[PDB]
């Protein structure tokens, strides 16, 4: 490649063709895989010149080369992205969204995605400069299938970055403006478009329940459930995240997920070979079992209690923690008959085995579940049968030893259990 000093000499020549050759040389240097010299390019003072080249309508090659060079600077650290914004790039890129040249409008989409992807402040600044209307205009075609694949994938990714990040979440009016286009992308048949649309929906549903409501009222839950069954892990992962976020909301929002048939996919998700899928599927189950008794009953009817026994018995420890929460929520909210059923499915032994975990939070969760199950047994007059079960599979020794445990809540709750039922 060229040296930075030679690039600087060409860019400072005031000869447009020399500037174009040098900008292309910078693009190629910034495109190399190992440590592109972003900081050297910034320190040479080239960003303002690249931003001025974005405006050269009569020289579309230098618009493209500078757009690509700035895209790659903005793909770096926050300080590097800030150098691009400080150079005036945001309005210049928004102006290029109108370019008659698809490869230039695409590169402007890409650069704005990196700028907005830096964090909430630059996301909101891109929105304030008016990026959403011209971005959405690029997708205002009757059938997305007429657009080139790579172009559509870059637009979907940039829109997903306008949905991303919190503190604050994106402006409500901006979300309302984007959502109809995002729902169209969520029904497109390209796996990368589907994955990034699913990620965008997942960001929009991670937050207060009013944000969940805005998404669920667009009718996306059935499509998310379809995507939960996809064979591509890059689609299943964000589809499950979005479903998981939705069931953190109201009981009615959770019911939409159940009504769409989500629970029928969970035998597969709760045994998926990818640890993170098992983990987030068990997290999802734990928020469903925090639901109404009729929602717990659907978990039962779908045969999922054995699957929860299974993940509590053997899984990565983070998944086992989510399983313990699922059991504590189930026993907190469930009917006596639902809790009897949980014991008949075999929960006691794997619950007791996890009391050996060197993790204070999961111990507290498990002791809470045990107390809830004892309260069910009191209503049936069967606390003795339960005490026997817990002792025979080694649980009494562990609870007895947790009396001498450091944490406050642990030794309290464990003392209580022994005093009342042992």
């Amino acid at each position: 490649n060229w040296s930075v000093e030679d690039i600087v000499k060409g860019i400072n020549s005031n000869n447009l063709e020399s500037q174009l050759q040098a900008t292309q040389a910078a693009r190629k240097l910034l495109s190399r895989e190992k440590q592109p010299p972003i900081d050297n390019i910034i320190r040479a003072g080239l960003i303002p010149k690249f931003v001025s080249f974005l405006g050269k309508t009569d020289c579309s090659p230098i618009q493209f080369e500078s757009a690509w060079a700035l895209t790659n600077i903005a793909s770096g650290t926050s300080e590097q992205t800030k150098a691009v914004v400080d150079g005036g790039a945001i309005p210049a890129f928004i102006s290029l969204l109108a370019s008659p040249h698809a490869h230039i409008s695409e590169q402007a989409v890409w650069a704005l995605g990196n700028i907005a992807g830096d964090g909430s402040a630059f996301r909101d600044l891109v929105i304030k400069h008016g990026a959403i209307d011209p971005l959405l205009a690029l997708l205002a075609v009757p059938d997305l299938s007429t657009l080139a694949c790579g172009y559509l994938r870059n637009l979907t990714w940039t829109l997903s970055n306008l949905c991303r990040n919190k503190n604050p979440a994106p402006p409500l009016d901006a979300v309302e403006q984007i959502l109809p286009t995002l729902v169209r992308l969520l029904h497109h048949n390209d796996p990368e478009v589907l994955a990034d649309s699913c990620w965008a929906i997942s960001y929009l549903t991670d937050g207060p329940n009013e944000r969940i409501e805005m998404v669920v009222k667009k009718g996306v839950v059935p499509q998310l459930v379809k995507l939960l069954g996809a064979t591509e892990l890059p689609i299943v992962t964000p589809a499950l995240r979005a479903i998981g976020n939705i069931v953190t909301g109201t009981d009615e929002q959770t019911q939409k997920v159940i009504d769409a048939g989500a629970l029928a996919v969970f035998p597969s998700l709760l045994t998926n070979p990818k640890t993170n899928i098992q983990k987030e599927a068990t997290w999802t189950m734990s928020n469903i079992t925090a639901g109404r008794q009729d929602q717990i009953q659907q978990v039962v009817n779908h045969g999922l209690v054995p699957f929860l026994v299974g993940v509590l018995s053997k899984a990565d420890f983070k998944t086992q923690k989510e399983a313990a929460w699922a059991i504590t929520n189930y026993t907190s909210g469930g009917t006596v008959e639902q809790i009897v059923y949980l014991v008949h499915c075999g929960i006691i032994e794997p619950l007791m085995n996890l009391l050996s975990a060197k993790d204070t939070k999961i111990i507290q969760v498990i002791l809470d579940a045990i107390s809830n199950i004892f309260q069910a047994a009191e209503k049936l007059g069967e606390t003795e049968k339960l005490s026997i079960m817990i002792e025979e599979c080694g649980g009494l020794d562990k609870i007895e030893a947790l009396q001498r445990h450091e944490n406050e809540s642990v030794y309290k709750a464990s003392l209580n259990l022994i005093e009342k039922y042992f």
Binding site: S31, W68, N72, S75, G76, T81, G117, D118, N329
Partner: peptide
């Protein structure tokens, strides 16, 4: 009251930015 919203850390999240290599 038992709902638990998503918690993530920085290492589990994947980058929001993408450079163009070719």
């Amino acid at each position: 009251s038992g709902k638990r919203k998503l918690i993530t850390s920085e290492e589990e999240r994947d980058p929001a930015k993408r450079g163009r290599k070719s």
